[PDB]
Design a protein around this motif. Structure first.
Motif, PDB file in Angstrom:
ATOM      1  N   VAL A 133       0.834  -1.199   0.000  1.00 29.51           N
ATOM      2  CA  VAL A 133       0.000   0.000   0.000  1.00 29.51           C
ATOM      3  C   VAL A 133       0.871   1.253   0.000  1.00 29.51           C
ATOM      4  O   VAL A 133       0.549   2.243  -0.658  1.00 29.51           O
ATOM      5  N   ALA A 134       1.997   1.221   0.714  1.00 30.14           N
ATOM      6  CA  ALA A 134       2.897   2.369   0.746  1.00 30.14           C
ATOM      7  C   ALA A 134       3.527   2.616  -0.611  1.00 30.14           C
ATOM      8  O   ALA A 134       3.689   3.764  -1.019  1.00 30.14           O
ATOM      9  N   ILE A 135       3.877   1.554  -1.331  1.00 25.94           N
ATOM     10  CA  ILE A 135       4.448   1.703  -2.669  1.00 25.94           C
ATOM     11  C   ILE A 135       3.439   2.355  -3.608  1.00 25.94           C
ATOM     12  O   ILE A 135       3.763   3.287  -4.351  1.00 25.94           O
ATOM     13  N   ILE A 136       2.201   1.855  -3.600  1.00 30.72           N
ATOM     14  CA  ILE A 136       1.145   2.400  -4.452  1.00 30.72           C
ATOM     15  C   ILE A 136       0.943   3.887  -4.190  1.00 30.72           C
ATOM     16  O   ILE A 136       0.788   4.674  -5.128  1.00 30.72           O
ATOM     17  N   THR A 137       0.955   4.296  -2.914  1.00 32.45           N
ATOM     18  CA  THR A 137       0.773   5.704  -2.558  1.00 32.45           C
ATOM     19  C   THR A 137       1.821   6.585  -3.223  1.00 32.45           C
ATOM     20  O   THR A 137       1.503   7.660  -3.732  1.00 32.45           O
ATOM     21  N   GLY A 138       3.076   6.145  -3.231  1.00 36.46           N
ATOM     22  CA  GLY A 138       4.123   6.926  -3.863  1.00 36.46           C
ATOM     23  C   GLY A 138       3.950   7.050  -5.362  1.00 36.46           C
ATOM     24  O   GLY A 138       4.376   8.036  -5.958  1.00 36.46           O
ATOM     25  N   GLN A 139       3.315   6.066  -5.989  1.00 32.12           N
ATOM     26  CA  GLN A 139       3.118   6.145  -7.428  1.00 32.12           C
ATOM     27  C   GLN A 139       1.977   7.083  -7.798  1.00 32.12           C
ATOM     28  O   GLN A 139       2.048   7.776  -8.816  1.00 32.12           O
ATOM     29  N   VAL A 140       0.913   7.107  -6.997  1.00 34.81           N
ATOM     30  CA  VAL A 140      -0.169   8.058  -7.227  1.00 34.81           C
ATOM     31  C   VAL A 140       0.317   9.492  -7.043  1.00 34.81           C
ATOM     32  O   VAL A 140      -0.077  10.396  -7.787  1.00 34.81           O
ATOM     33  N   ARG A 141       1.176   9.723  -6.053  1.00 30.15           N
ATOM     34  CA  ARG A 141       1.744  11.047  -5.842  1.00 30.15           C
ATOM     35  C   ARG A 141       2.499  11.532  -7.074  1.00 30.15           C
ATOM     36  O   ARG A 141       2.392  12.697  -7.457  1.00 30.15           O
ATOM     37  N   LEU A 142       3.289  10.658  -7.693  1.00 28.96           N
ATOM     38  CA  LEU A 142       4.024  11.050  -8.887  1.00 28.96           C
ATOM     39  C   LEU A 142       3.109  11.242 -10.091  1.00 28.96           C
ATOM     40  O   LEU A 142       3.289  12.193 -10.859  1.00 28.96           O
ATOM     41  N   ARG A 143       2.130  10.354 -10.285  1.00 28.10           N
ATOM     42  CA  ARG A 143       1.322  10.438 -11.497  1.00 28.10           C
ATOM     43  C   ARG A 143       0.377  11.635 -11.461  1.00 28.10           C
ATOM     44  O   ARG A 143       0.217  12.332 -12.470  1.00 28.10           O
ATOM     45  N   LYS A 144      -0.261  11.893 -10.323  1.00 28.88           N
ATOM     46  CA  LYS A 144      -1.096  13.081 -10.203  1.00 28.88           C
ATOM     47  C   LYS A 144      -0.303  14.322  -9.823  1.00 28.88           C
ATOM     48  O   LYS A 144      -0.893  15.402  -9.749  1.00 28.88           O
ATOM     49  N   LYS A 145       0.998  14.193  -9.572  1.00 30.38           N
ATOM     50  CA  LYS A 145       1.853  15.300  -9.146  1.00 30.38           C
ATOM     51  C   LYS A 145       1.249  16.044  -7.960  1.00 30.38           C
ATOM     52  O   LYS A 145       0.964  17.241  -8.010  1.00 30.38           O
ATOM     53  N   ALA A 146       1.078  15.311  -6.865  1.00 28.74           N
ATOM     54  CA  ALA A 146       0.472  15.848  -5.651  1.00 28.74           C
ATOM     55  C   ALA A 146       1.401  15.519  -4.489  1.00 28.74           C
ATOM     56  O   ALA A 146       1.437  14.382  -4.022  1.00 28.74           O
ATOM     57  N   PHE A 147       2.148  16.506  -4.026  1.00 29.87           N
ATOM     58  CA  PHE A 147       3.178  16.308  -3.026  1.00 29.87           C
ATOM     59  C   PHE A 147       2.797  17.020  -1.741  1.00 29.87           C
ATOM     60  O   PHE A 147       2.183  18.085  -1.754  1.00 29.87           O
ATOM     61  N   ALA A 148       3.143  16.406  -0.626  1.00 28.81           N
ATOM     62  CA  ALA A 148       2.792  16.977   0.658  1.00 28.81           C
ATOM     63  C   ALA A 148       3.807  17.993   1.130  1.00 28.81           C
ATOM     64  O   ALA A 148       3.469  18.849   1.953  1.00 28.81           O
ATOM     65  N   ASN A 149       5.024  17.942   0.600  1.00 31.13           N
ATOM     66  CA  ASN A 149       6.079  18.814   1.050  1.00 31.13           C
ATOM     67  C   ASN A 149       6.595  19.686  -0.086  1.00 31.13           C
ATOM     68  O   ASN A 149       6.721  19.223  -1.225  1.00 31.13           O
ATOM     69  N   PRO A 150       6.884  20.953   0.195  1.00 31.90           N
ATOM     70  CA  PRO A 150       7.422  21.822  -0.856  1.00 31.90           C
ATOM     71  C   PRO A 150       8.740  21.323  -1.414  1.00 31.90           C
ATOM     72  O   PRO A 150       8.923  21.351  -2.631  1.00 31.90           O
ATOM     73  N   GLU A 151       9.655  20.839  -0.568  1.00 36.57           N
ATOM     74  CA  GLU A 151      10.910  20.280  -1.071  1.00 36.57           C
ATOM     75  C   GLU A 151      10.661  19.132  -2.042  1.00 36.57           C
ATOM     76  O   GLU A 151      11.468  18.907  -2.949  1.00 36.57           O
ATOM     77  N   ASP A 152       9.542  18.416  -1.891  1.00 39.65           N
ATOM     78  CA  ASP A 152       9.187  17.393  -2.868  1.00 39.65           C
ATOM     79  C   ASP A 152       8.622  18.021  -4.136  1.00 39.65           C
ATOM     80  O   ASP A 152       9.063  17.694  -5.240  1.00 39.65           O
ATOM     81  N   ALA A 153       7.633  18.911  -3.987  1.00 37.41           N
ATOM     82  CA  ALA A 153       7.005  19.583  -5.122  1.00 37.41           C
ATOM     83  C   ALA A 153       8.019  20.331  -5.984  1.00 37.41           C
ATOM     84  O   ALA A 153       8.016  20.195  -7.207  1.00 37.41           O
TER      85      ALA A 153
END
Ligand SMILES: N[C@@H](CCC(=O)N[C@@H](CSCC(=O)c1ccc(-c2ccccc2)cc1)C(=O)NCC(=O)O)C(=O)O
Ligand SMILES: N[C@@H](CCC(=O)N[C@@H](CSCC(=O)c1ccc(-c2ccccc2)cc1)C(=O)NCC(=O)O)C(=O)O
Ligand SMILES: N[C@@H](CCC(=O)N[C@@H](CSCC(=O)c1ccc(-c2ccccc2)cc1)C(=O)NCC(=O)O)C(=O)O
Ligand SMILES: CCCCCCCCCCCCCCCC(=O)O
Ligand SMILES: CCCCCCCCCCCCCCCC(=O)O
Ligand SMILES: CCCCCCCCCCCCCCCC(=O)O
Lengths: 146, 146, 146
Positions: free
Chosen positions: C24-44
């Motif tokens: 489930v944690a792996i899947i979450t990271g892939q949705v973040r990249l595909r929808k480009k939705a990051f929780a942290n500015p350093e990530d965004a």
């Protein structure tokens, strides 16, 4: 603490990690007071008024770090305990446990320090290696006893 | 249950706490239905329409209480189990476990009852004392076996 | 793995569940990249700019599934381990563990697949039956040893 040669290493790394999570909880309470950002009105009204029942970006960051710990340390606590009793090479074993301890302690430093990408994400991946190694080992070990 | 004299006390307090968390989850589902506040559209559409896919202040409070439990009871479950086997004075031991059980049960009452500050925060601190006492004990005990 | 006849079943189901949470944690990271939705500015800022520091409905759903796992699997990890040593009928025991494993794996499928109500809620209730059965058993067993 000696029912397996790997178990002191595991218990040392495990409790340091639990204490480390306890430290993250303490830090969160201090950011709430300094930025005056409370989640509950009964808290806000006690510290200056209802306008302090509000979210803050820095408190939100602390909550994300604690949550990620719960996603990773708590499984390690199960996995490393059980792995400790699969009689791993006690070197390999504390290598697993030490890699996890050092990686997770580094993860919290990178999150709350707002360190540039991809530092936080690299530390998360390193820590998950021993856990993945431990889960596969436990799986075959239990599967073949069914 | 008798591999240490402290272990029945630990298992009794531990499972009461797990049941207590299970009770918090039940309450959360009832607030969602009564205020009609659903986190998922497939849930909202089933209970009256998409406008019920919404947040509610009282559901949010239930989620905060469950989260705080996960931050504290789950480490106790590890710490108190391991501490049970460091052969503590079985009086001191169940004193640790009872202080934690009584403090955490009081914590949930203060959160969901919207009790005035600082009741909830005092109960959190009391419960963390035995845990801190347990983590330090386990740390020296494991450290000196390395 | 054989200190109780129920323990391989427990360890097999438990580690599959931990691996399942890791998935489930792996899947979450892939949705973040595909929808480009990051929780942290350093990530965004690393993935295209600050405007990608944003919430997304699909990432939010992944986080809800992982959280529910933490509310249920982690107690099972404690309960099923302890129950494994209350010498349950090893059939009943793996029935408990298998019901929980199959129910929780079904729960994650229903959440992330956006399956119509009440599929997700039914799977949650099935999985909680063995846990409730296990917690009551452990409670009487520990209570009568006090
Ligand atoms: N719940 C996580 C799942 C993936 C994960 O754990 N990522 C690590 C490394 S970043 C890839 C992290 O630091 N996630 C930061 C966090 O969980 O807040 C998330 O929402 O990103
Ligand atoms: N995650 C906690 C960290 C500090 C804490 O656990 N505080 C206790 C006592 S209030 C000091 C609490 O009840 N926190 C309430 C909560 O976590 O919602 C928070 O965000 O306040
Ligand atoms: N934290 C849960 C408490 C009740 C629960 O666990 N519900 C299950 C079944 S739905 C009744 C679920 O899937 N909850 C979905 C979720 O927790 O996101 C919630 O906020 O609904
Ligand atoms: C426990 C882990 C310790 C984490 C403490 C924070 C490390 C970085 C210090 C923060 C400086 C600026 C902020 O942001
Ligand atoms: C399990 C712990 C039980 C918590 C139940 C709630 C206690 C207070 C009752 C709520 C009255 C008003 C609301 O808010
Ligand atoms: C681990 C559990 C596996 C969950 C994977 C997702 C199952 C359904 C596939 C999603 C299709 C559409 C989306 O939404």
């Amino acid at each position: 603490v000696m029912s397996s040669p790997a178990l002191p290493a595991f218990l040392l790394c495990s409790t340091l990690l639990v204490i480390k999570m306890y430290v993250v909880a303490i830090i969160t309470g201090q950011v709430r007071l300094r930025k005056k950002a409370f989640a509950n009105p009964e808290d806000a009204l006690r510290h200056g008024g209802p306008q302090y029942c509000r979210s803050d970006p820095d408190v939100e960051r602390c909550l994300r770090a604690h949550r990620n710990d719960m996603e990773t340390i708590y499984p390690f606590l199960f996995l490393g305990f059980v792995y400790s009793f699969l009689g791993p090479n006690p070197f390999v074993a504390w290598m697993h446990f030490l890699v996890f301890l050092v990686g997770r302690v580094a993860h919290t430093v990178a999150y709350l320090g707002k360190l540039r990408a991809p530092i936080r994400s690299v530390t998360y991946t390193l820590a998950q290696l021993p856990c993945a190694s431990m889960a596969l080992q436990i799986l075959w070990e239990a599967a073949r006893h069914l």
